[PDB]
Amino acid sequence: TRVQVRTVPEPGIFSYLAGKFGDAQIGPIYLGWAGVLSLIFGFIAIEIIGLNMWASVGWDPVEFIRQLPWLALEPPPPQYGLRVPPLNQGGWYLMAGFFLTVSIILWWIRIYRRARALQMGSHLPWAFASAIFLYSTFFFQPLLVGSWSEMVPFGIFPHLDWTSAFSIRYGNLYYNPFHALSIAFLYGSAVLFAMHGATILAVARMGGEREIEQITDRGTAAERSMLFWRWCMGFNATMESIHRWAWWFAVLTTFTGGIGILLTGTVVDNWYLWGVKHGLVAPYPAQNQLTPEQQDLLRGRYQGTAPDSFPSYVV
Amino acid sequence: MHRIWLMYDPRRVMVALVGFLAVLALVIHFVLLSSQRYSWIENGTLGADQAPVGASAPAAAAEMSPLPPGR
Amino acid sequence: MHRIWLMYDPRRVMVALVGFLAVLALVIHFVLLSSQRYSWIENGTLGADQAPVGASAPAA
Amino acid sequence: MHRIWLMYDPRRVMVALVGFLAVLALVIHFVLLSSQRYSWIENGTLGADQAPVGASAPAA
Amino acid sequence: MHRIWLMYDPRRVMVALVGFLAVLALVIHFVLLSSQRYSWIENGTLGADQAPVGASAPAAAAEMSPLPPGR
Amino acid sequence: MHRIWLMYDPRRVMVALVGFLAVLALVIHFVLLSSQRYSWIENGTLGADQAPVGASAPAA
Amino acid sequence: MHRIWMGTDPHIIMSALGSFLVGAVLVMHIWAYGQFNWPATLKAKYATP
Amino acid sequence: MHRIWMGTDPHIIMSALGSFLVGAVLVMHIWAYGQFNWPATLKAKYATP
Amino acid sequence: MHRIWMGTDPHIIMSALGSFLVGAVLVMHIWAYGQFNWPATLKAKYATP
Amino acid sequence: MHRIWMGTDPHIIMSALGSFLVGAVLVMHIWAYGQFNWPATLKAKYATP
Amino acid sequence: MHRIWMGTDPHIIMSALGSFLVGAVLVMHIWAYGQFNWPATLKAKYATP
Amino acid sequence: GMTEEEARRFHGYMVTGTLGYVVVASVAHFLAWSWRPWF
Amino acid sequence: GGMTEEEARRFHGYMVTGTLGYVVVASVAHFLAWSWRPWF
Amino acid sequence: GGMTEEEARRFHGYMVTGTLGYVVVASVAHFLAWSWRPWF
Amino acid sequence: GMTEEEARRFHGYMVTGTLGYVVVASVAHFLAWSWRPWF
Amino acid sequence: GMTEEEARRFHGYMVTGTLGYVVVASVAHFLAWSWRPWF
Amino acid sequence: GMTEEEARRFHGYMVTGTLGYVVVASVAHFLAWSWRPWF
Amino acid sequence: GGMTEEEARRFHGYMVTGTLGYVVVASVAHFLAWSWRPWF
Amino acid sequence: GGMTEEEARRFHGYMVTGTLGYVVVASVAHFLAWSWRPWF
Amino acid sequence: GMTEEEARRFHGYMVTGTLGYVVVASVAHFLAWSWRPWF
Amino acid sequence: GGMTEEEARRFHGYMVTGTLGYVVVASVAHFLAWSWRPWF
Ligand code: BCL
Ligand code: BCL
Ligand SMILES: CC[C@H]1c2cc3[nH]c4c(c3C)C(=O)[C@H](C(=O)OC)c4c3nc(cc4[nH]c(cc(n2)[C@@H]1C)c(C(C)=O)c4C)[C@@H](C)[C@@H]3CCC(=O)OC/C=C(\C)CCC[C@H](C)CCC[C@H](C)CCCC(C)C
Ligand SMILES: COC(C)(C)C/C=C/C(C)=C/C=C/C(C=O)=C/C=C/C(C)=C/C=C/C=C(C)/C=C/C=C(\C)CC/C=C(C)/C=C/C=C(\C)C(=O)O
Ligand SMILES: COC(C)(C)C/C=C/C(C)=C/C=C/C(C=O)=C/C=C/C(C)=C/C=C/C=C(C)/C=C/C=C(\C)CC/C=C(C)/C=C/C=C(\C)C(=O)O
Ligand SMILES: COC(C)(C)C/C=C/C(C)=C/C=C/C(C=O)=C/C=C/C(C)=C/C=C/C=C(C)/C=C/C=C(\C)CC/C=C(C)/C=C/C=C(\C)C(=O)O
Ligand SMILES: COC(C)(C)C/C=C/C(C)=C/C=C/C(C=O)=C/C=C/C(C)=C/C=C/C=C(C)/C=C/C=C(\C)CC/C=C(C)/C=C/C=C(\C)C(=O)O
Ligand SMILES: COC(C)(C)C/C=C/C(C)=C/C=C/C(C=O)=C/C=C/C(C)=C/C=C/C=C(C)/C=C/C=C(\C)CC/C=C(C)/C=C/C=C(\C)C(=O)O
Ligand SMILES: COC(C)(C)C/C=C/C(C)=C/C=C/C(C=O)=C/C=C/C(C)=C/C=C/C=C(C)/C=C/C=C(\C)CC/C=C(C)/C=C/C=C(\C)C(=O)O
Ligand SMILES: COC(C)(C)C/C=C/C(C)=C/C=C/C(C)=C/C=C/C(C)=C/C=C\C=C(C)\C=C\C=C(C)\C=C\C=C(C)\C=C\CC(C)(C)OC
Ligand SMILES: CCCCCCCCCCCCO[C@@H]1O[C@H](CO)[C@@H](O[C@H]2O[C@H](CO)[C@@H](O)[C@H](O)[C@H]2O)[C@H](O)[C@H]1O
Ligand SMILES: CCCCCCCCCCCCO[C@@H]1O[C@H](CO)[C@@H](O[C@H]2O[C@H](CO)[C@@H](O)[C@H](O)[C@H]2O)[C@H](O)[C@H]1O
Numbered sequence A: 001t002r003v004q005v006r007t008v009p010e011p012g013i014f015s016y017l018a019g020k021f022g023d024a025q026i027g028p029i030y031l032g033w034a035g036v037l038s039l040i041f042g043f044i045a046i047e048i049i050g051l052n053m054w055a056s057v058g059w060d061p062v063e064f065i066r067q068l069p070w071l072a073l074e075p076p077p078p079q080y081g082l083r084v085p086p087l088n089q090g091g092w093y094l095m096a097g098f099f100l101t102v103s104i105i106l107w108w109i110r111i112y113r114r115a116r117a118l119q120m121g122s123h124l125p126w127a128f129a130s131a132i133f134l135y136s137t138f139f140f141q142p143l144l145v146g147s148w149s150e151m152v153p154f155g156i157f158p159h160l161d162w163t164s165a166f167s168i169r170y171g172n173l174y175y176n177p178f179h180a181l182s183i184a185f186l187y188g189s190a191v192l193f194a195m196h197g198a199t200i201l202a203v204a205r206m207g208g209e210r211e212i213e214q215i216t217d218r219g220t221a222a223e224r225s226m227l228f229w230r231w232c233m234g235f236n237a238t239m240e241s242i243h244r245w246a247w248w249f250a251v252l253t254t255f256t257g258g259i260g261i262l263l264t265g266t267v268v269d270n271w272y273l274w275g276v277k278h279g280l281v282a283p284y285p286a287q288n289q290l291t292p293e294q295q296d297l298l299r300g301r302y303q304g305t306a307p308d309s310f311p312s313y314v315v
Numbered sequence B, E: 001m002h003r004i005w006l007m008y009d010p011r012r013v014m015v016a017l018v019g020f021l022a023v024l025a026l027v028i029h030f031v032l033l034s035s036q037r038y039s040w041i042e043n044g045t046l047g048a049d050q051a052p053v054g055a056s057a058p059a060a061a062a063e064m065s066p067l068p069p070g071r
Numbered sequence C, D, F: 001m002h003r004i005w006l007m008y009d010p011r012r013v014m015v016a017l018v019g020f021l022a023v024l025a026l027v028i029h030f031v032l033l034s035s036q037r038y039s040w041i042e043n044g045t046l047g048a049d050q051a052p053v054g055a056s057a058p059a060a
Numbered sequence G, H, I, J, K: 001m002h003r004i005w006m007g008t009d010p011h012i013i014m015s016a017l018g019s020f021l022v023g024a025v026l027v028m029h030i031w032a033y034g035q036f037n038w039p040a041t042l043k044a045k046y047a048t049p
Numbered sequence L, O, P, Q, T: 001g002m003t004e005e006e007a008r009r010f011h012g013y014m015v016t017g018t019l020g021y022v023v024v025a026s027v028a029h030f031l032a033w034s035w036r037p038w039f
Numbered sequence M, N, R, S, U: 001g002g003m004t005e006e007e008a009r010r011f012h013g014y015m016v017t018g019t020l021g022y023v024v025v026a027s028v029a030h031f032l033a034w035s036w037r038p039w040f
């Protein structure tokens, strides 16, 4: 540390090369046609969201900053189903969702084209495709249950309100087995990157961070990395294949997540009762017991429409 | 005016222009399709004096309801 | 007065100006379209004597 | 006073100034637009004697 | 006192000073604007005697039993 | 006592001093502004006898 | 007394003095219009009943 | 007293003076239309009942 | 008097003057149409009862 | 006593003195206008009934 | 006695003394206006009912 | 960068294009005002 | 680097002429307007 | 840079002439205004 | 890197543009005031 | 990059395409106006 | 900045301007006093 | 490098004058604010 | 640098004179004020 | 690094500025006390 | 650095004189104030 080198002519043969790696231009941050369109479409999505949020505090710029994390652009009302809603009642929402979705897909194309231009494997766009898959289930599951009202509101705390209410509506998402699997891969991704980051830093003195050299021409840094884990837990990866474990654990997080969302409300409407059926639910002693009259008295109603009048009670 | 193409690479400009026209046309069509007066897919066959006027109220529909009947 | 273009690259100033005006035009149209008085897609055919005004009706 | 432009590059100063003025002007317009008294898009036609006024002292 | 400008860069102190004064000026205006007495955009046309004033100590027992508002 | 400025650099200390005083002054003003007794922007024109006072002991 | 101007710039001095006079004159007129009830009497003379 | 103009640029003087005159004239007219009840009497002359 | 034009581009002068006149004339006509009640009396003359 | 000015800049002295005089005079006039009931008696004289 | 000034700077002394006097005089007047009933009796002398 | 006359040529287009756009916007406001005045 | 003095002398004469022409046409306009709807 | 004394002397003559001419026209305007609607 | 000659030249425009901006803002304020006073 | 006469050639098509596009848009608006006017 | 000879010329006009301004203002106040005296 | 002492005196003279001129207009701003709506 | 003794000598004369002039005008102001509305 | 000659001159200003600040703050406190005492 | 003994001799003389002038003025102020409103 604190003996930095500084390179005046271009590294890659501080500063950066202007040049080519074959088809790939080097120098500027690569956009291409798909990147430019992605930024245009995505900018309009961001603008629609922000202008709707700002309009919802009556254009007040102080309240716009003060209340920002509570502001929402909110999906359509439920009784429209999949029909086009009024502009102020979710029409802007669906428009922002459309441009955001196009922008994401154009960004995927931009990444896919750049990987091929740099003569690299396709691993990164298929990893990004797993994230896009989960994102798209927030469109397809509302579609499969038949109403755009079930979509996720654009907003910091509002989308967390939706996340809680989704688990409530479908009877506790902890008992969704694909949610449980998605968490196992999310935690496993933290386990792996902690283990791997610490491993490579522990052998960095021996050139272990030069992972491509260690893959093509195994050094003592790779050998010590393999022996540490073999001696610790009885089995080991290689300098290459640890990156496959990493890749699959990240990818399976959003892939199993997306399946869990698609199943919810379409195949299972109450995951806790599915858990009871399949033997997941641990028994506890009863906290209360209803009499047969209470079983009729304490059933409620399903929630209906809001009252559209202001009754007088003149009596 | 032609020297604008010496200042800006037309190969870059045309992509931005097409992108701008694409988002603009799509915004306007979605705006109209969500309006009352111009929701032409549902109501395009109405005559001009039959079409909605003045329907600017922000909550024209109920916000809260069950989903429509599943079958 | 033209020496401003020796001081700044006009190739960048024009892009900044065009981007600023495009965003500003979009903001103003959105603000108006969100209003009641200028909700012109729904109410543009109203004459100015019966367009909305931001006041409460007298004596209710 | 013109020696001040020897101490600061006007390329830097004017970009900062134009940015400040544009942001400040937008903030002021939107502060006015969201007030009762100056919500001119809805109520600009009213005339000064019947524009809103914030409530006088509660001790009234 | 001028030797302070040997101790500090006279170019950079100016940027620090203007930045400080701008932030302080904005803070005081927004503190005032959010107040009731000095919400001048809504109530600036009020005379000083009729501008709002914050709550006061009752200057009494704070105990005298109430009477209903006249019907 | 000026020998203390052979130990500590005036450049470092005068920045640290101005910083500390500015933070301390600002903390005290906002502490007072948040109080009932000294919310002077709303209540600064009240006389000393009219200003709020915190609750005494009842002793009974 | 003229020695006070040595090392000053005329255009600074006239710009400062000009800014002062414009500010002072406008402050004084706006104050004066409040006290003297003019143009308020002028307006009343030609106002429509 | 012409020496005041030395070192200046005549286009800058005309831009500065021209700006001031436009501003001053408009403020005076906006103010005068408020006091003199004109064009309000003109408008009332040709208004329709 | 002519040499105020020196160093300027005649096309900018004609552009500034031309655009000023367009704005001024449009403002004057919008204002005048309001005071003089014309074309309002034109419209009423040919309007269908 | 003049020796006190040695090593000073006279423009700073005139600036500091002038800024004190402005501040002092304004405080004195706000205060005096309060105590003496003037211009309040001036406004009352020319006020409309 | 004068030896006390050796090693001082006269501007430092005059600025310190000038500061203390301005502080002392202001405090004494603010205090005096509290105890003596003045300017309160002056204000009441010219106040209108 | 630009030469001085090359900047002078650009400034001619830039100024005239600005004032042209302001003239078109002026008529747009004339039409909007005639349709629905905001004061 | 714009107009030289002889260009400016030429340009001034035309600008004077155009301004006089504009004012003359406007003088006829105001005379007609005064005959139609006098404003004092 | 900018104006020399000879340019300044020449410029000043027109500037004075313009200022006086503007004051003259304004003086007529005020006389007409006063005789139309006196303000004191 | 400004010369003192360029700095003098630039300052004349900066003063002029500032004065033009202040003049327009002054007319804008007096229009706003006469339509709806804030004091 | 591009030469001036090559820019002149390209500009002629840009003008022509823009005009043709604005013409189609003008017919589209007048059809829409005749069907359901917005003022 | 101004030399001592420049300062002497500037002072002469500055005094002349200041005095003339005060003269005109004195007439303005006498007229104002004759119209609406303030004590 | 750094600041030469004759430049520092020139800079200080401006800086102090500017500071005091700012305080002067802020003084008038408080004079106007106080007479519109005093805070004590 | 700052003022020499000779500069300070003649500066002091003008500064004393200006102060005495200011006090003279203020003395007349108070005499008129006392005549108008005495405060003791 | 600094000389004692400079340290002498610095400390004089430093202590004088401390005194001026303490003086102003003392007037500020007595004004505040006179307006609304806290004991 | 700082003031020498012969400077300090001269400075002390004025400092004493100023202080005596201040005390003389303040004495008149208190004699007038006592005559106006005795505080004991
Ligand atoms: C009360 C709340 C509920 C609950 C409700 C939900 C719901 C509802 C969901 C999850 C989901 C997830 N939950 Mg759970 N969850 C709860 C409790 C937990 C607990 C815990 C300790 O209790 C944990 C660790 C988790 C963990 C997890 C993750 C495993 C999983 C999300 C994976 C992922 O990467 O998403 C983050 C990744 C994404 C969202 C992908 C985004 C990719 C796109 C392409 C990014 C675009 C960016 C864009 C261009 C940027 C600009 C945008 C504009 C600004 C708008 N939950 C309880 C039971 N949980 C999700 C899931 O898969 O469920 C099965 C899901 O939908
Ligand atoms: C070509 C060089 C100059 C020019 C030269 C002239 C000349 C010469 C005349 C005018 C005239 C006018 N111009 Mg011009 N004018 C220019 C740029 C402008 C711009 C602008 C946005 O830059 C505007 C708003 C104007 C506006 C105007 C009006 C004030 C005026 C009335 C006619 C008119 O508007 O026709 C519509 C014009 C426009 C919207 C401008 C663009 C059209 C073309 C490219 C340029 C002007 C053509 C001119 C009007 C034709 C004159 C015919 C004569 C018989 C010779 N001009 C260019 C930069 N202009 C006339 C006048 O003074 O009438 C009182 C006049 O005789
Ligand atoms: C394997 C599962 C995990 C995953 C993976 C993942 N995400 C990825 C990738 C991968 C492998 C990418 O390669 C991709 C990426 O680009 O990464 C940097 C991406 C990405 N993951 C993202 C976010 C993200 N990922 C998340 C999660 C996850 N990502 C999972 C945990 C989350 C969560 C937890 O909520 C978020 C929010 C993005 C940072 C990025 C995709 C970026 C994208 O699609 O952008 C589209 C464009 C816009 C949003 C518009 C921006 C508009 C500008 C701000 C406007 C500025 C003005 C503009 C210049 C105007 C136009 C003018 C034109 C002329 C230019
Ligand atoms: C309603 O309430 C409120 C609004 C308050 C009411 C109040 C309103 C007020 C205050 C209005 C004020 C208006 C005003 C005041 O001045 C208005 C001023 C108007 C003016 C100035 C008009 C001038 C017009 C000039 C024209 C048309 C000139 C044309 C010239 C031409 C065609 C010649 C071109 C050819 C040339 C040059 C030769 C080139 C040679 C070359 C190059 C060569 O030879 O090289
Ligand atoms: C309502 O309530 C409130 C508002 C409170 C009431 C109070 C209001 C108040 C206080 C008003 C005060 C107003 C005022 C104060 O001073 C007003 C002052 C007005 C002034 C200064 C007018 C000046 C006019 C000057 C003119 C027209 C010049 C014309 C020049 C021309 C035509 C060209 C000259 C020649 C050139 C350029 C070429 C030269 C040669 C060259 C270059 C060469 O040869 O090289
Ligand atoms: C809640 O509170 C709330 C409600 C918010 C209340 C608010 C409160 C506050 C805190 C407001 C603050 C306001 C403020 C400061 O503080 C405001 C400060 C404003 C300022 C400074 C404005 C200045 C504008 C200046 C302009 C436009 C200049 C333009 C110049 C031009 C065009 C010429 C360019 C140069 C040329 C052409 C020459 C090139 C030649 C070259 C290169 C050559 O020759 O080489
Ligand atoms: C209401 O309740 C509370 C507020 C409590 C009540 C109590 C109030 C109190 C306590 C008030 C006390 C006030 C006070 C106390 O001291 C007030 C002191 C006032 C003073 C001192 C005023 C002095 C003014 C001096 C002036 C105008 C001088 C001008 C000089 C001029 C024009 C000459 C300039 C030219 C020069 C120099 C030549 C340069 C030559 C050069 C360079 C050369 O030759 O080189
Ligand atoms: C809510 O209730 C809570 C808050 C919680 C209760 C608790 C309160 C607590 C704990 C308070 C603590 C207070 C405190 C503790 O330390 C307070 C300490 C305060 C202090 C130290 C103040 C010191 C100020 C000093 C100043 C301003 C100096 C200015 C210097 C100047 C102007 C000189 C400028 C010129 C120079 C330098 C030239 C040099 C020459 C050179 C270079 C040359 O000549 O070469
Ligand atoms: C209400 O309740 C509570 C508040 C509790 C009640 C109690 C209050 C209490 C306890 C009050 C105590 C007050 C007090 C205590 O000490 C008060 C002490 C006051 C004093 C000391 C005043 C002194 C003033 C001195 C002055 C004005 C000097 C001016 C000097 C001049 C004009 C000379 C200028 C020339 C010079 C210098 C020479 C340069 C030559 C040079 C350089 C050369 O020759 O080189
Ligand atoms: C002037 O510029 C301003 C100042 C306004 C710019 C500032 C803007 C600001 C401050 C913006 C702030 C944005 C924030 C804070 C956004 C927060 C967003 C969050 C947290 C979002 C979280 C989740 C959202 C999700 C999952 C949304 C998913 C939506 C989907 C999948 C929608 C898809 C829609 C599709 C595919 C299609 C719709 C159209 C159809 C085909 C149905 O036809 C009608
Ligand atoms: C800068 C160039 C672009 C200018 C763009 C337009 C700016 C708009 C403001 C210009 C001036 C407006 O001018 C003002 O117009 C209003 C419009 O109601 C007229 O108002 C009058 O006539 C109209 C006619 O329709 C009636 O509806 C109205 O009841 C009556 O009061 C005023 O008599 C006139 O003084
Ligand atoms: C819809 C109508 C209203 C909007 C009109 C928009 C277009 C502008 C109208 C005026 C057109 C003529 O405008 C004029 O064009 C010429 C070139 O022809 C420009 O001329 C510019 O380039 C030429 C070379 O080509 C240079 O020699 C010249 O110094 C420079 O100014 C002028 O700067 C501009 O003022």
Ligand SMILES: CCCCCCCCCCCCO[C@@H]1O[C@H](CO)[C@@H](O[C@H]2O[C@H](CO)[C@@H](O)[C@H](O)[C@H]2O)[C@H](O)[C@H]1O
Residues within 6 Å of the ligand: G007, G008, G009, G012, G013, G016, G019, G020, G023, J009, J011, J012, J015, Q001, R009, R010, R011, R012, R013, R014, R015, R017, R021, R024, R025
């Ligand atoms: C919008 C503003 C409205 C309110 C009024 C503001 C008033 C501002 C007062 C400005 C007075 C300028 O007066 C004086 O200018 C000169 C140069 O001209 C500066 O002089 C400065 O530079 C010169 C060299 O040129 C040095 O020799 C000198 O030591 C230094 O102080 C002074 O520092 C300043 O005191």
Ligand SMILES: [Fe+3]
Residues within 6 Å of the ligand: A196, A200, A211, A243
């Ligand atoms: Fe790795």
